[PDB]
């Protein structure tokens, strides 16, 4: 995936393009929550999403962050809701 291929497509479809490259990696880390985490991350700068696709420590760091918030939220909706 190149930045050129990305400008070639429109917004909505650029995330789809990026998600395809991101999914397999995020999946390896979390097979079950993969879909969701990916979805959550796709609302970030493509320029930075492009960076994460080249930096594992960065991708992982972002993934763990998403995992934490995701669980804290759900747990919240559990105690009260």
């Amino acid at each position: 995936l190149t930045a050129s291929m990305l400008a070639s497509a429109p917004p909505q479809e650029q995330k789809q393009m990026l998600g395809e490259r991101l999914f397999p990696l995020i999946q390896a880390m979390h097979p079950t929550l993969a879909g969701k985490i990916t979805g959550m991350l796709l609302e970030i700068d493509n320029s930075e999403l492009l960076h994460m696709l080249e930096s594992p420590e960065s991708l992982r760091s972002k993934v763990d962050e998403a995992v934490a918030v995701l669980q804290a939220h759900q747990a919240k909706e559990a105690a009260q809701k």
Binding site: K15, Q16, G19, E20, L22, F23, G35, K36, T38, G39, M40, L41, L42, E43, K62, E65, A66, V69, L70, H73, Q74
Partner: peptide
Amino acid sequence: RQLNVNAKPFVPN
């Protein structure tokens, strides 16, 4: 660094 927990899940293709 702010994330949306209600973001629509992505699906492979």
